[PDB]
Amino acid sequence: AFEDELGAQPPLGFFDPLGLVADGDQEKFDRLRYVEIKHGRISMLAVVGYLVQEAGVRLPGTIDYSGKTFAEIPNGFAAFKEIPAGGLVQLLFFIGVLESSVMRDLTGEAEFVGDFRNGAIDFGWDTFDEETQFKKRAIELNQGRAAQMGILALMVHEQLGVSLLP
């Protein structure tokens, strides 16, 4: 059914040990694929952010008018103890607004799930041939899969207190 879909590749081939898409429902597959791409994009950004922040890189100066500095804010979950309440509200709200109003198929012209270009932002999708376009989608998906496991590893081991970083 979906043995030929994007994401079935060497060395495992089509890999669905829980038969989640064995029923051949295209809409179920389309949703799960949407969810898989989304977790992957978030996790790709999350691993880079965790590593950059772990290395001590900080925005210059202060995060609020009381004089709280980005430099005082630690990496990991501990960051949330030191970001001011108003900043946490804004971060959650403005990610929510991406979810409600931006990062979605607004016009119905998406070529496949995860295509949010919306006839608005495009760096040249059609300059890739069909094989290259498929390759780029596969890289996006599989980098996303690897990063999902990577960010889970970093979050878990932060709590374990067994570091995975030099």
Ligand X SMILES: CC(=O)O[C@H]1CC(C)(C)C(=C=C/C(C)=C/C=C/C(C)=C/C=C/C=C(C)/C=C/C=C(\C)C(=O)C[C@@]23O[C@]2(C)C[C@@H](O)CC3(C)C)[C@](C)(O)C1
Sign for the pseudo-dihedral over CA of 65, 68, 58, 156: negative
Binds ligand X by CB under 6 A, chosen from 21, 47, 73, 141? 47
Gap between the Cα atoms of 73 and 77, Å rounded:
11
| Residue 149 interaction partner, one of its own copies, Ca ion, ligand X, none, beta carbon < 5-8 Å per kind | ligand X
H or E element: which one contains 78? none
User: How many other C-beta atoms are found inside a 10 Å radius of the C-beta of residue 63?
Assistant: 19
Gap between the Cα atoms of 137 and 1, Å rounded:
20
Q: In this structure, are residues 135 and 122 in contact, taking their beta carbons and an 8 Å threshold?
A: no
For helices 26-54 and 130-160, the axis angle rounded to 10 degrees is 60
Binds ligand X by CB under 6 A, chosen from 44, 63, 73, 141? 44
Nearest Cα neighbor of 110 from 96, 122, 128 is 122
- Does position 147 interact with ligand X (CB under 6 A)? The reply is yes
Q: Which residues bind ligand CLA (CB under 6 A)?
A: 2, 5, 7-8, 12, 14-16, 18, 20-21, 29, 32-36, 38-39, 42, 45-46, 48-49, 52-53, 57-59, 63-66, 70, 73, 75, 79, 83-84, 86-87, 90-97, 99-101, 121, 145, 148-149
Closest-approach residue to ligand X (CB): 150
- Does position 146 interact with ligand X (CB under 6 A)? The reply is yes
| Residue 44 interaction partner, one of ligand CLA, ligand X, Ca ion, none, beta carbon < 5-8 Å per kind | ligand X
- Does position 53 interact with ligand X (CB under 6 A)? The reply is no
Query: Where are the strands (E) in the chain, listed by range?
Result: none
- Does position 55 interact with ligand X (CB under 6 A)? The reply is no
Contacting residues toward Ca ion, per CB under 5 A: 72
Q: Could you tell me which residues are annotated as the binding site for Ca(2+)?
A: 72, 82
